Ligand binder design. Structure first.
Ligand SMILES: *Cc1c(COP(=O)(O)O)cnc(C)c1O
Ligand SMILES: *Cc1c(COP(=O)(O)O)cnc(C)c1O
Ligand SMILES: N[C@@H](Cc1ccccc1)C(=O)O
Ligand SMILES: N[C@@H](Cc1ccccc1)C(=O)O
Lengths: 415, 415
């Protein structure tokens, strides 16, 4: 009654409960979606330059983006998407990719509108939809029929997907690479999704914050570069996952003027300006990355290789301890199947109809000194019972952390 | 139809049209609500320190605030308000005071709710209310019955104010010191407002971004320090107006847990984190200001004195050219009565039923080389006809700017 109905349901945040049980133990922390090593030197230094240069950089910049940043966004992303991107009509800088999503949802989703969300989903898609009056409509990526799995075998059933569309579908949220699965959507998969979007005339909010974290030669493709798609896609990105600087909380949306003009209204009636100096640091960091595009020494080349190594490392470590990893083609994350521990150990300390993975993650934190995130926080509530056997690890870590993890894992092994 | 109804009306932004007519002339810019000199050294250096210190500061901080910043906010503001402020239950760091307002409005205002807005009002109060489904209800500060006016003579008629309250009033937006008037609400005025708020059980969103810019010995008082008021006030502030660093876009809301828990839901479903390093810079800048509280050398002492000088300077300059200044007790701004020019010059190039002040500001920009902001952008549309004779100047400026202004003003004088 004091508060607005838009807040009904969405008030519960799984984060906080867990990342507070973590702090009351000696743990190797692998549930955190951020690096624990520094950003690359050229980007820190870019921040350093923007806070020590033209003093007017301490003041307000332009409402829809710091112009050097919208310039490099238009240019680099225009080239990657193969699109004529106008910085002033097609680019909006936002408070991280999170603020970008929020802006998008507030612009487009209204009482009645359905938003197709593909599980496992970054958890905020659902509450943001709900705050906007929409009705989430879920579809599940289903794993295919070795022993170690693969993210790319998680299938988007074409018939099941097509069935989700009604005349009330406003938007489909596509997240690639996917958090927490690490699926990198194929071209065929993208075409599938594009196909229905054109057909039913539906916007595709597409969260590509992990664009650059792709492994094993898999290729990040943007649904917006697909024929006819720009006119109906919003493409979100994040400086933080791009330059390993998550506390910079800069992101952007690219998309066509007839959509973006709504995003801009929300922006101008919510935050109005983004901080100036972060924008400057990000503009200079993209400049440095475009200069060196494809090159052995570009961050978008070395970083994925390094993190591919960390991934490979984690996969091996968790495997030999009973966990069944799903090799990701991208993102910061891999998930592991715990179905074996569920048989081995079915009753665990945990509240009433708490899904297994949640009860398991608590167990592990206490006894074995390791943080993961239960995957069920990324399923609609009705699907948590069926999808309660996965947990989510972050391998974007310092080597000292992989070391400490192995220490934890060997102490475990002796059981 | 593609976009959400919450965007109806609110899409028009007076800013942009004007600050683009400005850039196509040689102008002294006085419509900008930000300094054009640097922030104080200790605050720039605080930024410099947070972007070159513990590298983990490049990563995510806590959702509701960087803890060193919520610590100093609780402590300093607790002391100023005379209130026990818990950082975790009573403080939320937001994307500037703008993001704070937005958070507040999204938390509390719902279809039906009325929000009492006092004119002249910072323009966003109205559209934010509207996006939230609310119904702005207006009241006007009316100037009293010398020749030069005074902001403190603009009166909040007690009977007129009381009449605005219905059973549908959710919130009253109090802005003190006031943008664009520079009114510093008296204690009696505050008690008036408090009185009705307690009586009708209404929240008082109170925008105190100008807290420290008070002149002539006038005292900034917070409605929240008034008896019984904390339980029903939200107090917003901004690092940018506090430390002359508007592009830092850090702000906060203080208020009681039973209200703030809603602000937090909006926050966690909108931005989730604020950038880390700005927070660090602001925490250290408050630390430096509290250390030196009241002291000759504290920024909260010298800065108001300096800006009081700039104010005094502008008042004299604009006076002798026909403009009738209203001396502000606070804020960055003074407004001047142009009623004389309206008689002197009634027909001006400007669209159809454009209020006079808007047409006047355009005229001045072209011919006389000076930027102001028409005050009518801060009145409800039905009241613009009656309140079309004021324009708004920003005196928070470098001396080189006051110089150039005088140059413009003397070239003018020869007419
Ligand atoms: C981390 C993450 C975000 C948030 O990006 P920020 O720049 O931190 O706002 C958005 N989407 C996904 C899928 C993420 O993993
Ligand atoms: C400038 C201003 C704001 C905005 O504060 P930011 O920290 O820039 O968000 C809010 N309210 C008033 C009355 C202002 O003048
Ligand atoms: N996305 C990262 C971090 C994050 C958490 C909550 C909001 C935004 C980003 C994760 O899944 O751990
Ligand atoms: N508040 C200042 C600057 C500002 C403009 C628009 C949004 C937020 C802050 C002004 O009135 O000029």
């Amino acid at each position: 009654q004091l508060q607005a109905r838009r807040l009904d349901g969405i008030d519960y945040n799984p984060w906080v409960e867990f990342v507070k049980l973590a702090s009351e133990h000696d743990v190797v922390n692998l549930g955190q979606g951020f690096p624990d090593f520094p950003p690359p030197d050229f980007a820190v230094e870019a921040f350093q330059h923007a806070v020590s240069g033209d003093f007017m950089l301490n003041q307000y910049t332009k409402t829809f983006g710091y112009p050097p940043l919208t310039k490099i966004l238009a240019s680099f992303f225009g080239e990657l998407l193969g699109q004529e991107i106008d910085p002033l009509r097609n680019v909006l800088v936002t408070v991280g990719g999170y603020g970008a999503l929020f802006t998008a949802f507030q612009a487009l989703v209204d009482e009645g509108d359905e938003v197709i969300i593909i599980e496992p989903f970054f958890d905020c898609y659902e509450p943001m939809t709900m705050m906007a009056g929409g009705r989430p409509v879920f579809v599940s990526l289903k794993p295919g029929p070795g022993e170690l799995g693969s993210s790319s075998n998680w299938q988007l059933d074409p018939m099941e997907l097509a069935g989700k569309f009604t005349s009330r579908t406003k938007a489909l949220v596509l997240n690639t690479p996917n958090n927490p699965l690490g699926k990198v959507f194929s071209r065929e998969e993208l075409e599938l999704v594009a196909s229905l979007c054109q057909q039913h005339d539906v916007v595709c909010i597409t969260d590509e914050v992990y664009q650059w974290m792709v492994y094993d030669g898999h290729q990040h493709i943007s649904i917006a570069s697909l024929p006819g798609m720009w006119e109906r896609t919003l493409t979100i990105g994040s400086a933080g996952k791009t330059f390993s600087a998550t506390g910079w909380k800069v992101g952007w949306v690219l998309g066509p003027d007839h959509i973006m003009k709504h995003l801009r209204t929300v922006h101008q009636n919510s935050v109005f300006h983004c901080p100036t100096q972060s924008q400057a640091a990000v503009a200079e960091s993209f400049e440095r990355e475009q200069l060196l595009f494809r090159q052995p020494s570009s961050y978008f080349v070395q970083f994925p290789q390094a993190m591919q190594r960390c991934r490979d490392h984690m996969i091996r470590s968790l495997q030999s301890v009973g966990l069944k990893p799903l090799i990701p083609q991208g993102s910061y994350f891999l998930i592991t199947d715990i179905s074996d521990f569920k048989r081995k150990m079915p009753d665990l300390p945990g509240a009433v109809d708490e899904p297994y993975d949640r009860r398991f993650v608590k167990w592990m934190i206490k006894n074995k000194g390791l943080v993961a995130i239960p995957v069920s926080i990324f399923y609609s509530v009705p699907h948590q019972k069926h999808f309660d056997h996965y947990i989510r690890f972050c391998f974007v870590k310092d080597e000292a952390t992989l070391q400490a993890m192995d220490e934890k894992l060997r102490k475990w092994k002796v059981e």
